[PDB]
């Protein structure tokens, strides 16, 4: 096996941390870096390839893509860091007024029995002429910090998940003066940020998630067998992984009602498979169609971040043209893309006449 | 050697008249009812018979996809036609 992933222990957290944001210079415009989504499943697409020099040039190729449900994130805070001889240090963070119930659920282990008063005194700071305190923290970030990050949380009431406790993370603000990005973060308070604004089509991203667990496994399946360097039994899976160079093929809007339609096939259909995504449900929000496979089980929190370096391949900066998107059922050997297509093929049934 | 393209066809009368019906069924792809360049009267008779149903014509078109019941049905239909046509047995 590989000694670069040697401490094969369970991840300390279920969310997964970025661990590196792309290097910042003030010349680029102000932008965000990362976002969160929920893994929905996989589907098959047909792509009109435009790869000069390849055997499949000017031909149709069938590829596997993964769907990540991406409801808009709400910006509810701002954090500032300073450079020290001991690394980066958090100087102060400025929260927004009027936090939602979901983001407060993250702060509690027993939300149902609690007297929900998180940030109750902090809200009075805004509205009781202690706005000097809020501005003093904002000015402190401007004149002392070198990196400013945004606290954004998901909206899982839109996600078909039984979990009600949202997910917080810090997203770095890159490309600008420290003063410019602080005004950027304050203006984003209490506001939803959509995925098509953070990323876009035919760009290559990195995804961070915790892998599927397998429990106690022996040497045959853990280390791949035909001291610290000797294969042993232990935990396999549930490991933090950072996969890079995954191309976004499509960003769906959710309100389009024709998300899975292309310029080639004129079928008004959404991305959700016939009968729903197996073990997940229906994607009713913005979604990111990522090529290939991505670490994590279905309905697992998914961390999307930008590439740390400018790309060196023609796989990037190449246009992606879609011909057809599969929507047939994943619960079996499906053969119908729409409910209408099934009824047209089989005619009318005994129950159809009895009801009518 | 010589049987390239891995395809062979005969006429239906040949299957009727042969002494080894099993050999023709096991070694050929299609039993054709196409009127010969000259014009076979037996093909006209065998095509118009009521014994040869739609199922019989389906099996003759594709011999390599047939099973036990289909092959027996072909042999039975051969015997019935031979009785009509006056062949020995």
């Amino acid at each position: 096996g590989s000694l670069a992933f040697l401490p094969r222990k369970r991840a300390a957290r279920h969310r997964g941390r970025v661990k590196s944001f792309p290097k910042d210079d003030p010349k680029k415009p102000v932008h965000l870096t990362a976002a969160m989504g929920y893994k929905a499943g996989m589907t098959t697409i047909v792509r009109d390839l435009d790869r000069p020099g390849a055997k499949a040039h000017k031909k149709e190729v069938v590829e596997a893509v993964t769907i990540i449900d991406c409801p808009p994130m709400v910006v509810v805070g701002l954090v500032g860091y300073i450079e020290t001889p001991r690394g980066l240090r958090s100087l102060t963070t400025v929260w927004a007024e009027h936090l939602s119930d979901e983001v407060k659920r993250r702060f509690y282990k027993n939300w149902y029995k609690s007297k929900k008063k998180a940030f109750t005194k902090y809200a009075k700071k805004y509205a009781e002429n202690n706005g000097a305190s809020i501005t003093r923290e904002l000015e402190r970030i401007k004149k002392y910090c070198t990196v400013v990050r945004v606290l954004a949380h998901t909206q899982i009431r839109k996600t078909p998940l039984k979990q009600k406790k949202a997910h917080l993370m810090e997203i770095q603000i890159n490309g600008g003066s420290v003063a410019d990005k602080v005004e950027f973060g304050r203006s984003l308070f209490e506001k939803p940020v959509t995925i098509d604004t953070i990323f876009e089509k035919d760009e290559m991203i990195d995804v961070i998630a915790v892998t599927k667990g397998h429990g106690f496994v022996g040497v045959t399946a853990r280390w791949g067998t035909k001291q610290w360097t000797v294969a042993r039994a232990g935990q396999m899976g549930y490991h933090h992984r950072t996969s890079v160079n995954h191309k976004i093929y499509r960003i769906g809007k959710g309100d389009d009602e024709a998300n899975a339609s292309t310029e080639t096939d004129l079928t008004k259909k959404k991305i959700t498979p016939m009968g729903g995504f197996v073990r997940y449900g229906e994607v009713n929000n913005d979604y990111v169609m990522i090529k290939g496979s991505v670490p994590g089980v279905k309905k697992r929190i998914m961390t999307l971040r930008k590439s740390l370096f400018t790309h060196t391949s023609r796989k990037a900066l190449e246009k992606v043209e879609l011909k057809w998107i599969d929507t047939s059922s994943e619960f079996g050997h499906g053969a119908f893309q729409t409910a209408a297509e099934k009824k047209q093929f089989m005619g009318t049934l005994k129950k159809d006449l009895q009801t009518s | 050697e010589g049987d390239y393209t891995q395809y062979k066809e005969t006429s239906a009368i040949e299957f009727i008249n042969t002494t080894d019906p099993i050999a023709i069924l096991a070694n050929y792809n299609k039993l054709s009812f196409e009127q010969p360049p000259n014009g076979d009267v037996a093909l006209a008779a065998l095509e118009k018979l009521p014994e040869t149903t739609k199922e019989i014509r389906a099996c003759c078109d594709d011999l390599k996809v047939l099973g036990k019941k289909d092959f027996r049905l072909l042999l039975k239909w051969r015997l019935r036609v031979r009785e009509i046509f006056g062949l020995p047995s």
């Binding site: 098959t44 005619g347 | 389906a58």
Partner: protein, 179 residues
């Protein structure tokens, strides 16, 4: 990029579905799933299996003569591209589809034409032979209804109303054993 049809069952075979078998005679067989592929390797007859289009067409369960189903066929002579032609073709297809289903609905009703006549005829036989299992009120109910009719002053109509109301409105097994 085309929607193919299964060789065994005729279901819509979409890209990256099923498996294709290439025969030495130079013929390709397309299957939509492993169910059809495995039946083909076992040399079953799709015309005999009842879940296939081959059986349904040959058994009279599907319409095989119609003006609508002749509109679609495989084209071996390409037609030069024409934006107007393609746009009206799409509108023609939509019109064709709703005419087909709204012709297929009549086909099914014609197949099941005489079904209620058989159901009532069988129901008439069952009641005629099992008249003792019909609702029959209760002995206590008849007495209590008779006194109520006497107090009111139409016992037959009152009984019929009681009979209907109970029929409009299950027995358990065993019961409590006293401790």
């Amino acid at each position: 990029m085309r929607i193919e049809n299964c060789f065994f069952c005729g279901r819509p075979a979409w890209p990256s579905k099923g498996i294709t078998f290439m025969r030495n005679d130079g013929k390709a067989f397309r299957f939509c799933r492993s169910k059809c592929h495995k039946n083909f390797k076992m040399k079953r007859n799709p015309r005999k299996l009842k879940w296939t289009k081959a059986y349904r067409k040959n058994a009279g369960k599907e319409m095989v003569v119609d003006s609508t189903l002749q509109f679609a066929a495989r084209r071996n002579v390409p037609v030069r591209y024409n934006r107007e032609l393609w746009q009206k073709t799409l509108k023609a297809m939509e019109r064709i589809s709703e005419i087909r289903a709204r012709r297929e609905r009549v086909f099914y009703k014609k197949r099941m034409a005489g079904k209620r006549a058989r159901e009532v005829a069988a129901a008439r036989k069952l009641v005629a032979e099992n008249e003792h299992l019909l609702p029959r009120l209760r002995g206590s109910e008849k007495r209590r209804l008779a006194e109520l009719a006497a107090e009111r002053g139409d016992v037959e109509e009152l009984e019929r109303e009681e009979l209907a109301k109970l029929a409009s409105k299950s027995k358990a097994f065993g019961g409590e054993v006293r401790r």
